[PDB]
């Protein structure tokens, strides 16, 4: 499987209407080698997708939002499911690839009483401490603090890309231009060139090394 293979089928997969939803698993299958994707917890917290795949023969971990289920909103179960997978991938030098399409967090009294703050902080922490190379692609939406949740540029995110249909805003800023001019995304790439860009970024980032203050261990908000 060539690393420069194009994916023209991704050019029109994102519907123009924000209400209409799409399948992120299709994008994941298109991007990865041989369209092979080993999903983890496929029937639990379906509004987030985590799994293992290969790019140019190298094992990678993939985390993404699922607009089909709950419109991609993040809740307690999705937060924990993504956080533990990200921690495991970071612990064993496995690069991470993130696909971002999130409107925010699921509201309600049940979510607040269940401790949505703690699990959101879990996901922020898991994405923040990761020292493995990480590549983030924004497909349609990144609203509120949820954009900061899934590997923003300010969490030591190495390379960030946005599709022409992406939109980043504080509240419910209808274009990715503010993020581009502010330097929050490295480039606005065509959807059909995602695979080659990701492969090149992984190739150049394979030798990343960072230094952090010494500690026995940190205090993750478990």
């Amino acid at each position: 499987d060539p690393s420069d293979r194009l994916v023209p089928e991704l050019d029109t997969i994102v519907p123009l209407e924000s209400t209409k939803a799409y399948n992120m698993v299709d994008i994941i299958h298109s991007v990865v080698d041989e369209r092979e994707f080993f999903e983890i917890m496929p029937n639990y917290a379906k509004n987030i997708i985590v799994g293992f795949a290969r790019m140019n023969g190298r094992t990678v971990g993939i985390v993404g939002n699922q607009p089909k289920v709950a419109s991609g909103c993040l809740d307690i179960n999705s937060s924990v499911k993504g956080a533990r997978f990200v921690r495991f991938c970071d612990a064993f030098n496995i690069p991470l690839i993130t696909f971002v399409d999130v409107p925010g967090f699921l509201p309600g009294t049940a979510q607040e009483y269940g401790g949505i703050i703690r699990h959101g902080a879990k996901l922020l922490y898991a994405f923040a401490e990761a020292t493995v190379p990480k590549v983030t692609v924004i497909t349609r939406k990144a609203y509120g603090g949820a954009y900061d949740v899934m590997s923003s540029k300010h969490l030591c995110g190495d390379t960030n890309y946005a599709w022409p249909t992406a939109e980043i805003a504080v509240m419910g800023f209808a274009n990715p231009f503010p993020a581009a001019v502010r330097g929050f995304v490295d480039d606005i790439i065509q959807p059909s060139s995602t695979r080659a860009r990701i492969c090149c970024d992984l190739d150049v980032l394979a030798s990343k090394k960072v230094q952090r203050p010494w500690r026995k261990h940190a205090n993750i908000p478990l």
Partner: protein, 673 residues
Amino acid sequence: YDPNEKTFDKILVANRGEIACRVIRTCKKMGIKTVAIHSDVDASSVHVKMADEAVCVGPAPTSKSYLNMDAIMEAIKKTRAQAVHPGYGFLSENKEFARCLAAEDVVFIGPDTHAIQAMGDKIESKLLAKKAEVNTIPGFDGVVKDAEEAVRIAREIGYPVMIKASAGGGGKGMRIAWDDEETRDGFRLSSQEAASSFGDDRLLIEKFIDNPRHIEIQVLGDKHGNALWLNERECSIQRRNQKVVEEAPSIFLDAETRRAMGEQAVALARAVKYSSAGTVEFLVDSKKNFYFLEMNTRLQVEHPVTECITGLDLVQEMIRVAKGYPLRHKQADIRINGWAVECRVYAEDPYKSFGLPSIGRLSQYQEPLHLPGVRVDSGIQPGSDISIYYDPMISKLITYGSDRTEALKRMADALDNYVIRGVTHNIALLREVIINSRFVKGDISTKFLSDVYPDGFKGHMLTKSEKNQLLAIASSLFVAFQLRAQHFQENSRMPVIKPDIANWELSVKLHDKVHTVVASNNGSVFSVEVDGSKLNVTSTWNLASPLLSVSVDGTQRTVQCLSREAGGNMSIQFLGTVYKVNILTRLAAELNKFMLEKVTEDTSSVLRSPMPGVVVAVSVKPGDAVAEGQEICVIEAMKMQNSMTAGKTGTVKSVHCQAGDTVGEGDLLVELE
């Protein structure tokens, strides 16, 4: 293709799909600027991308996008288009469009309003054809109004009877009756659907020909009074009175009969004062006697195939005729220039009623354009979406050659080298048709699918040698994947000790049988032992390419690996049909022998929805006992409607589908006992 010749500068294409792209390609070859219309859904289709400028002509549905005429006139006024080409279907036969275009200065590329007015219905078209000295189906002219008159006409025109709903068309409002009571009941029912569907409320009674051949004559006319006929075509292979396999040079007709066909068609066209391109259809019995049946006053769907035997471009000639220029070809200039066969690839499941339309998105789409003598007329691309609004058509595959055998071989190769992933197509059905013994021999009829496949399409009945080749290829591919899985980069800390297994003993479950396979690997050559048979399989073993070419015992075979699982299940498209195989190791087979069959409730008694689309109405309610052959509901989609029967007796526990609702493919409609 002379650009010095002066023609229209701007041309508008008021259509969609493959025909829009074909017209745009012709116009680019002729140097004419092109503009195309589209709905909101088709905002990134092939034709809108390849044609300069584009205007949205309405929402998704055709009735408000490609039939919202005021939008078309506004678009023409905005773009100052001198002419419009309707393609086929939609507004290709709307006389109000003709008069509206005549109101302005925009010229309409096609037959004049008088020709379509004459060929708008059946009966007076038959009258004018008979006045033109043209052989026609024997029958009774005039409007049938009562069942008594219908049964009397049945008596004096012969026992086989056929009831036709005039106007409309497209394989609807048509029935065959074999009895006087059948005659009257079919008459009243057909009047009912004519009121429901067409609204004409006027029928026709005709004699039914047994084992007919459907032969088409392509005719061209101009405003200068010149009429020409371009050879013949053969399109007997059809289901639901809809064509699937088309053949330009008829193997059944000889030279003098073909010349008679052309002369009669030219005379009929001159009678109508036809001044455009059209097709006249005929029914030929076993005694080489031809009878008239309809003529389409538009470009036919199977137009390209005759081009492959003539060399001229139909669209270019139509545009030149519309400009005013006369024909530059005479009767003697046109000759047969080889052989050609065309197949219509649809987005339908061939295992249900010889075609079962489905919806979806194209994950992968690759065309065999690099194969010799292959032409593809398609309007889709990787990522195209199939809606519930338009034709379920995918593309047309045309293969031309020196003779029958070479063209059919090229057709089979192209069908083998065609990649469609995302929807279900009828490639297997087309391949079985083109490799059938009768089709190669040439003995076909309009009911070829009905009698060759009585109970419906089942797939390819692979022979012993083909079965052995398939098993060998599957085993070799499985072993190749296993060997590739062992290739790791050097670790320098824990060196990888590659296993040195020599022979792989595998159990392959196919259909319902289990075979033992012994595989040995040597470089790129696999020696495969299947139940005593010995085979050698060699290839590049590229495990990422969708198409895999393998040389098994010298024979070259192209296979596709549609699916693959760690449990051993593999779906392999081989010789058109897709087979599901289960490959395990022999030890794994012995251990799996103890695995239970589980509590999987294979008791049926549940009916699902093979139709994605909109259900018109539901004939059952919660608490009804269904019966064999009783249809549950009618679902409209893909410009047609059909109802599915339960096939068993059972009380309805609950009803989940209501009239006017939308039900997707595979959804549970009604639960029965």
